[PDB]
C-alpha cells in the first residue's frame, strides 16, 4: 500500500546540433503518466496514462509553462557546469534530476527526494531533512551556495510536504483501479537439458505489477545466490513486468531445488518446483 511520485528530468547538450534537449517524465510508482519533450514538433505536456486525461486545460498549461521554463534554465545550468569543470565547448554533457515524495500505506509523507547528477555521477542531493544539501565535489559546492541564497531547500520542502503529496493522493484516487491494484505474477518452471549430466531449471514470473519482486532458487532449502542467473526485471509493454531466475543442476537432482516468489499481489509467497 506504499506509493510514490517522481519526476525525471534529462537535459542533454549537443554542440553543433542545436540547443540542449530537455525531457521530463512523471511517474506514480511504476506507471508513467506525463511527458514533455523540447524536441517535439509542438512542445507541450502530454498525457501518458488514461486517468490523467480528466485534468483540464489549466493543468496542461501550468505543466507546460513549468517545463518550458525548465528547458531554458537547464540550458543555462549546462553552460554553468561546463565552466565549473573547465570542459571544452566540444563535448556533449548531461544533467539529470529525479525528485518526488514517498507515502506510507496510511497515505502520510514518509520522505522527500531531490537529487541531481552530471554525466551520470552524483552531483547534488537534498538531504532527508529537506533543509540541507550534499555536494559531491567543489563544482557542486558552487551550485550549493547559489541554492542556499535563493532559499531553494525551503521551497522544495514546501512542495514535497504540500503539493507533491496532495497531487499524488489525487492521482492515486483518480487511478485507483490500476494504481492501487497489485497484479500477482503468473509463475512456472521450465527444464532444458544442457548436456548428459546437467539441466537448466528456469523459474518464470509474468504479468505482475508493480515491478518489485523477489525470485530466488534454493537447493535443499539454502539460497543459491552465486549460482543463480537472474535477469533484470523487464516491462511487458501492457503495464506489467516480467522476470526469470535460472540454475544449472545435476541430472537428476531436480527435486532438491525450489523456486521462491514474493510479490505484493500474492496473499501467500510461492514455492514452486519443476513438474515433469
Amino acid at each position: 500500500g506504499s506509493h510514490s511520485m517522481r519526476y525525471f528530468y534529462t537535459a542533454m547538450s549537443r554542440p553543433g546540433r542545436g540547443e540542449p534537449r530537455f525531457i521530463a517524465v512523471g511517474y506514480v510508482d511504476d506507471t508513467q503518466f506525463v511527458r514533455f519533450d523540447s524536441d517535439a514538433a509542438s512542445p507541450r505536456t502530454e498525457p501518458r496514462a488514461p486517468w490523467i486525461e480528466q485534468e483540464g486545460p489549466e493543468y496542461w498549461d501550468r505543466n507546460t509553462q513549468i517545463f518550458k521554463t525548465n528547458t531554458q534554465t537547464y540550458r543555462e545550468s549546462l553552460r554553468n557546469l561546463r565552466g565549473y569543470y573547465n570542459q571544452s565547448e566540444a563535448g556533449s554533457h548531461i544533467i539529470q534530476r529525479m525528485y518526488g515524495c514517498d507515502l506510507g500505506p496510511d497515505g502520510r509523507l514518509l520522505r522527500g527526494h531531490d537529487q541531481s547528477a552530471y554525466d551520470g555521477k552524483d552531483y547534488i542531493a537534498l538531504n532527508e531533512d529537506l533543509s540541507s544539501w550534499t555536494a559531491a565535489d567543489t563544482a557542486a559546492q558552487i551550485t550549493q551556495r547559489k541554492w542556499e541564497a535563493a532559499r531553494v531547500a525551503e521551497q522544495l520542502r514546501a512542495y514535497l510536504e504540500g503539493l507533491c503529496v496532495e497531487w499524488l493522493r489525487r492521482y492515486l484516487e483518480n487511478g485507483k483501479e490500476t494504481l492501487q491494484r497489485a497484479d500477482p505474477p503468473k509463475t512456472h518452471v521450465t527444464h532444458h537439458p544442457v548436456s548428459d549430466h546437467e539441466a537448466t531449471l528456469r523459474c518464470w514470473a509474468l504479468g505482475f505489477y508493480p515491478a518489485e519482486i523477489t525470485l530466488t532458487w534454493q537447493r535443499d532449502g539454502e539460497d543459491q545466490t552465486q549460482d543463480t542467473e537472474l535477469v533484470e526485471t523487464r516491462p511487458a509493454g501492457d503495464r506489467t513486468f516480467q522476470k526469470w531466475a535460472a540454475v544449472v543442476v545435476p541430472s537428476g537432482e531436480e527435486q532438491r531445488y525450489t523456486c521462491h516468489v514474493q510479490h505484493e499481489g500474492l496473499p501467500k509467497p510461492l514455492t514452486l518446483r519443476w513438474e515433469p
Binding site: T69, T73, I124, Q155, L156, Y159, L163
Partner: peptide, 9 residues
C-alpha cells in the same frame, strides 16, 4: 504536479 520553481545551477 511538478515543482514550479526553476533555479540555475
Amino acid at each position: 504536479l511538478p515543482f514550479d520553481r526553476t533555479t540555475i545551477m
